[PDB]
Amino acid sequence: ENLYFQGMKKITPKKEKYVIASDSTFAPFEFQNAQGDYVGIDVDLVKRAAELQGFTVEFKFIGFSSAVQAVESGQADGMVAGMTITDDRKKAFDFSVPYFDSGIQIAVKKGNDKIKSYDDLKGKKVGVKIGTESADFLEKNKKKYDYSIKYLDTTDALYSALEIGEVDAMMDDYPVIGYGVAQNQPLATPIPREKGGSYGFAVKKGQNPELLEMFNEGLKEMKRTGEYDKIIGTYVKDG
């Protein structure tokens, strides 16, 4: 309420260490730097939120579906993995305040001339990461456009499959493809993005409320100081 208040609400941890599950490579959200350490928007936001408030977090970069299962089972306390907030997922998870606006998009090989619309995917192969918003879109529209869906395990696997010609196109989150394009990966995006959803930090529904509160209060603080915008701008420098 007090907009001139320069402090923070005190959120008290209840565990010596909270385990945070994540995807294994999903740049710019979580990915390895030159030293092999994981960095990225998700990693920086969660680690800084914890630092701001005396929480200790331990990241496990295990894959998207693995992270979902770990939080559901109680083996991880929370997850961050560029995870879209949806109503269906709210049945299993409590989500933070949204921290990023996203959506999905097709990518094809740089130099591809054939594919300019979804209808051009007729008789083609589209790679996608199992368990994701992209997979849901492709299944919904498979009858309509008449492509075949190939299920892969990671975003790196999508890029590999596309590049060596195992698939004709892939579908993944648009800022992820965009980061790849910005570092000259051989990707093109001839079909407009499907905007939709924001990302959230997630805990199991009804569990670990203070961990969720810690993220929310940290995000508020980082938004107030501009640290949030500096973190994003560390990875996304597209003007």
Ligand SMILES: NC(=O)CC[C@H](N)C(=O)O
């Ligand atoms: N890490 C991912 O692949 C997440 C993809 C998408 N945002 C989802 O929540 O399904």
